[PDB]
A paper describes a structure:
In the ethanologenic bacterium Zymomonas mobilis ZM4, the gene ZMO0922 encodes a 148 amino acid polypeptide, which has been annotated as a putative ASCH domain-containing protein (ZmASCH) that belongs to family 23. Here, we report the three-dimensional crystal structure of ZmASCH which confirms the fold of a central β-barrel core and reveals a positively-charged cleft with a pocket on the surface. In vitro assays showed that ZmASCH bound nucleic acids and possessed cleavage activity specifically towards single-stranded RNAs. The weak nuclease activity of ZmASCH depended on magnesium ions and the protein appeared to prefer the consecutive pyrimidine-adenine dinucleotides for its cleavage activity.
The structure of ZmASCH protein comprises five α-helices and a six-stranded β-sheet, the latter forming the central β-barrel. This β-barrel is flanked by two pairs of antiparallel α-helices (α2/α3 and α4/α5) as well as the single helix α1. There are two and four protein molecules in the asymmetric unit of the trigonal and monoclinic crystal forms, respectively. The conformations of individual monomers are in excellent agreement, and all monomers superimpose with RMSD values of less than 0.3 Å, with the largest deviations in the loops between strands β2 and β3 and helices α4 and α5. As the ssRNA-cleavage activity of ZmASCH was dependent on magnesium ions, but inhibited by other transition metal ions, such as zinc or cobalt, co-crystallization of the wild-type protein with either ZnCl2 or CoCl2 was attempted. However, we could not locate any bound transition metal ions in either crystal form, suggesting that high affinity binding of the metal ion to the protein molecule is probably accomplished in the presence of a nucleic acid.
Author numbering: 6 to 148
The structure:
Amino acid sequence: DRKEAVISLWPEFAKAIVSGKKTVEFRRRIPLPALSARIWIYATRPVKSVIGFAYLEAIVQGDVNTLWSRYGREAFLSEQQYRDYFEGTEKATAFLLRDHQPIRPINLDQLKEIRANFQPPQSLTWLRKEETQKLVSLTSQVE
C-alpha cells in the first residue's frame, strides 16, 4: 500500500503546489505512489514544514524534451531549472496533481514527534498508517 507519501520541495515550488499553480511535479527515478495517493508537501528551509497536500491523478513516464514541451507550463519551474534537474538523463517522470489543499503548517518538531528520526525526504517517504492518522489529526485551516 502506497496511498500516503511525503515529498520535499523548495518553498516557492511547495507553495505553488498547495495553491494549485503547480499541477505537474517532475522527478528523476522515484518510487511510484498508487493512483489517487495523497502527496504531502514538505517545504524546505526556511519554512521547514508540511504545508498541505495534493492527490496523484496520473503518472507520466517519458523523454525529457517532450515532457518539457507537454507539461512544463504546468510545472512552474523555469526551463533552465528543469534542464539542470534532468542533466545527464533523457528519461523523466511527471506526477500530475489535483485537489490541492493548503493547511496550517506542521513544523519539523511535530513531524519528529510523529516519527522520531523524520528527515525531509530526498525523493519520497511512505507514511505508515498510524503516522498518517497522527498527521491528519494535526491538520487545520490556514490562518
